[PDB]
Amino acid sequence: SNLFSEKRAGNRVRFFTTGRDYFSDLASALDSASSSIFITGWQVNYDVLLDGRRSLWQCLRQALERSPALKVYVMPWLSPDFETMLAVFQLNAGLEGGARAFCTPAIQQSDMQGLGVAFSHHQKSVVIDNRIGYVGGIDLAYGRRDDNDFSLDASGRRGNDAYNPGLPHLGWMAEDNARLAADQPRMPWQDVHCRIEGPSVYDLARNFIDRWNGQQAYLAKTPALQDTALVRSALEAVMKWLNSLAELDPPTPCWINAPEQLPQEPEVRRGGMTVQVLRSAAARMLEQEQAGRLGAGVNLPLQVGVSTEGVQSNCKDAMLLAISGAQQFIYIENQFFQSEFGKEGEVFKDLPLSGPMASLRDVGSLRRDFVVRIRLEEALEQRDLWLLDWAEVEKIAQEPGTEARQFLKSMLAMWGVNAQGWLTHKLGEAQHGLLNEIGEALARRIERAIQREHPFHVYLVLPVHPEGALNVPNIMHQVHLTQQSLVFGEQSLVKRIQRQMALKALEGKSDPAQAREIIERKDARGRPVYEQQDWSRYLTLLNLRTWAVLGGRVVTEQIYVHSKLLIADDRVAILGSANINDRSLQGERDSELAVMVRDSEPLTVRLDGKNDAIVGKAIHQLRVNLWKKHFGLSQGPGGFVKPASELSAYLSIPAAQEAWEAIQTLAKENTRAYERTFNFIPQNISQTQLQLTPEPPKGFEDGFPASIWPTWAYRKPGELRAGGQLMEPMPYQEIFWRSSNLTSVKTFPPPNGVSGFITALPTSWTRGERNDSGLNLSILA
């Protein structure tokens, strides 16, 4: 209970349900700046158009020129560059008097020891004249600006604002110079953000200033100079309190300590929206904050019960409590969902790594004759690249043919891959399994409704897969983990709801001490009984996805759920930077910023369609307004996806059963429609893998689970270890898009009768595959 701040009434909050909204409101805010502009983010591209005409840089410049006192402070995260300092340099260029705009790349401050390089500052905050505060999931970066059309036509933006990290860029920029070819689709951005006025902006400013003055006390580029900086600050401080009574050298700090920039303690207000500001901050971050408060001499009046010392897991804590006090339903949007799930489960035995993943780092992927000839496994166990038969590799490099070339190529590839793993594994310890308990908590809230015979329901909107191409090792690994937390881990979120349903199903039909054995009992297709329960009665799992005709091509890509948002009962909303993973929630690792928000303005709804329930007006809207976005009820002229008006009746009865059955049904039909044409999108049953047996093998009744790479097929459906290949192209492949002169471009029937953007999360995707990149799990957790 190390609170970074505590609830304050009296706030006015405006939610932003689109990228374009936030960006446009930001520009108009900067048009009004006068004293100070605090910016911080995980990534800050000074060149993004905010109102589709002016770059951030221009608004910053136009503002410095207008307001002669305006001081401007950027705190980008410091990726293990020149761009940011140069841009800031350019903001001070030709200015009136000295420089008024400053930067400070923020080095991580996590408690992760030698693993500490792999963590960041993930906060997305901007604060203007200590009067307008922004916070949410949206950085000021390429690909973020987006509306409710979720268009795929990259051609309308320029630069890397034609965003799509999962696709080879095979077009050209007319003034390297690559970009998204006309026929290639953008990847759309669904995110949630908010502006805040009232007392709580104080806590937002305090987070910025204390964080800035923290990195300054440690701005010293060398560990050595750093003691000299902390003895100079101890001295210029005693000098301040004395003037208030009547070679080897550190840098001159740049404090934020002038009174214009500092904000004045808020009064106790009442009404409007109650807001609490929440951080994920590590103990080491917390001390270096205490450091700067001495350095700059800024001790901003704290509230009673806030903590200047200890790890801060306000994000995970706030979420947990909202999850347990929820009465009717939970609705979550989040880019991540990896949470503790017990023993890993459902990987095939006699297949150590998944096929695809083994093709990227298992040496058995390669011919045994070349692997023994160069003595690969001797080197691999000794991690001496040079402990190899360099005589036999020449013999192989002199041998003509493709199999000899592809070998040496993939051989070095696996070495580089594996070597990564070894690194991360020696930088620190590898936690076993996941740590945060949002899974357990959701499962537990559901079981309380199961056991006491109440209705309840949890909505989860996630990305189809993490952004990028599905063949990158870590990305595979995040999927693998994501499914573990949802469907596969022996204590996964569905297996937990299901056990519980099974257990209540036996009430008064068997002895209670026996039940835990009865539900774990095995059936005909080898699965346990508890899996006979329809968890759909409590949990809905949705991906977002659109399609389009671009350049005469039928294409599809996912709509990326970057949102980090949670709502319950339309009474409470938790908004910000925190992903349902360990990096964000635990506190000691990545730094995060979020808010809890409640509305004192009430409103009456039948959340279950029958009984009166009181909700917060602004929170109720937000969920309704989002549900419109993804239901297609908010787009405008154009696009290839019809409004899903069948759903427009359910926006105001989220806890009614009809409602989540509606959404469940359409999302199954929408996904079935895409599956009819697209054999590459992640999905439950593989459509490239053929049964070559008389009877489907054990468990593979009904079909074969799709690979992480869905057009993959295993060569020998018994020797899953033997391997396999890509029966057909994947989007991430060049050959997906241009006919290599040998072979021609495949294409696809347009999806027929899709409505809205809502999709069914493949609960079977990857089943059986262990896609373990071999990187230290604490980095992927």
Contact letters (x/-) for Ca ion, 581-620, by CB under 5 A?
A: ----------------------------------------
CB of 656 to Ca ion, least distance (A): 28
Q: Which of residues 456 and 757 has its CB atom nearest to Ca ion in the complex? A: 757
Amino acid at 557: E
Do 768 and 775 touch, CB atoms closer than 8 A? no
Q: Strand runs (DSSP E) across 157-305, as ranges?
A: 171-172, 178-179, 189-190, 193-197, 273-281
- In angstroms, how far is CA 394 from the centroid of its own chain? 45
CB of 635 to Ca ion, least distance (A): 3
Q: Rule CB under 5 A: which of 289-328 touch Ca ion?
A: none
Do 200 and 270 touch, CB atoms closer than 8 A? no
- In angstroms, how far is CA 31 from the centroid of its own chain? 31
CB of 307 to Ca ion, least distance (A): 47
d(CA 732, CA 726): 12
Q: Which of residues 151 and 533 has its CB atom nearest to Ca ion in the complex? A: 151
Sign, Cα dihedral of 89, 91, 96, 101: negative
CB of 322 to Ca ion, least distance (A): 33
Applying CB under 5 A, the site for Ca ion has a residue count of: 4
CB of 637 to Ca ion, least distance (A): 7
CB of 396 to Ca ion, least distance (A): 55
Does 467 sit near Ca ion (CB under 5 A)? no
Q: At what angle do helices 493-505 and 438-452 cross, to 10 degrees?
A: 20
Q: Which of residues 150 and 736 has its CB atom nearest to Ca ion in the complex? A: 150
689 is in an annotated binding site: no
Only one of the segments 144-152, 479-487, 525-533, 644-652 lies at the binding site for Ca ion (rule: CB under 5 A); that segment is 144-152
CB of 25 to Ca ion, least distance (A): 22
CB of 192 to Ca ion, least distance (A): 20
- CA dist 189 → 143, 145, 192, 509 (Å): 7, 7, 10, 50
Which ranges in 280-338 belong to alpha helices (H)?
Answer: 283-292, 314-324
Strand partners, 276: 596
Q: Which of residues 153 and 772 has its CB atom nearest to Ca ion in the complex? A: 153
d(CA 578, CA 559): 19
Only one of the segments 148-156, 319-327, 351-359, 684-692 lies at the binding site for Ca ion (rule: CB under 5 A); that segment is 148-156
Q: Which of residues 418 and 635 has its CB atom nearest to Ca ion in the complex? A: 635
d(CA 427, CA 116): 9
The half-sphere exposure of 206 on its side-chain side, counting CA atoms within 13 A, is 24
Match 């359910």 to its residue by tokens. Answer: 650
Residue whose C-beta lies closest to Ca ion: 639
CB of 557 to Ca ion, least distance (A): 16
DSSP letter for 269, please. -
Burial class (CB in 10 A: 0-12, 13-18, 19+), 698: exposed
558 is in an annotated binding site: no
Q: Which of residues 637 and 694 has its CB atom nearest to Ca ion in the complex? A: 637
Does 639 sit near Ca ion (CB under 5 A)? yes
Q: Which of residues 35 and 151 has its CB atom nearest to Ca ion in the complex? A: 151
Do 491 and 341 touch, CB atoms closer than 8 A? yes
116 is in an annotated binding site: no
d(CA 240, CA 286): 24
Only one of the segments 4-12, 147-155, 170-178, 404-412 lies at the binding site for Ca ion (rule: CB under 5 A); that segment is 147-155
Q: Which of residues 149 and 608 has its CB atom nearest to Ca ion in the complex? A: 149
Q: Which of residues 157 and 211 has its CB atom nearest to Ca ion in the complex? A: 157
Does 149 sit near Ca ion (CB under 5 A)? yes
Does 365 sit near Ca ion (CB under 5 A)? no
DSSP letter for 347, please. P
CB of 634 to Ca ion, least distance (A): 9
Q: Rule CB under 5 A: which of 468-507 touch Ca ion?
A: none
d(CA 486, CA 439): 8
Q: Rule CB under 5 A: which of 535-564 touch Ca ion?
A: none
Q: Which of residues 639 and 724 has its CB atom nearest to Ca ion in the complex? A: 639
Q: Give 331's contacts (C-beta < 8 A, 6+ positions apart).
A: 458, 459, 566, 567, 568, 623, 654
Strand partners, 332: 460, 566
Instruction: With CA atoms as reference, report the closest residue to 23 among 193, 201, 207.
Output: 193
Match 């011919």 to its residue by tokens. Answer: 367
CB of 753 to Ca ion, least distance (A): 17
Contact letters (x/-) for Ca ion, 65-94, by CB under 5 A?
A: ------------------------------
Question: From the list 94, 223, 401, 638, which residue makes contact with Ca ion (rule: CB under 5 A)?
Answer: 638
Instruction: With CA atoms as reference, report the closest residue to 501 among 461, 462, 541, 528.
Output: 528
Which ranges in 632-769 belong to alpha helices (H)?
Answer: 657-677
Q: Which of residues 39 and 544 has its CB atom nearest to Ca ion in the complex? A: 544
Largest Cα–Cα distance of the chain, in whole Å? 97
Only one of the segments 141-149, 401-409, 546-554, 592-600 lies at the binding site for Ca ion (rule: CB under 5 A); that segment is 141-149
- 446 φ/ψ sector (left φ>0, alpha ψ -120 to 50, else beta): alpha
Only one of the segments 143-151, 237-245, 313-321, 345-353 lies at the binding site for Ca ion (rule: CB under 5 A); that segment is 143-151
Question: From the list 2, 635, 679, 755, which residue makes contact with Ca ion (rule: CB under 5 A)?
Answer: 635
Interface residues with Ca ion (CB under 5 A)?
149, 635, 638-639
Binding residues, as ranges, are 149, 635, 638
Binding residues for Ca(2+), as ranges, are 149, 635, 638
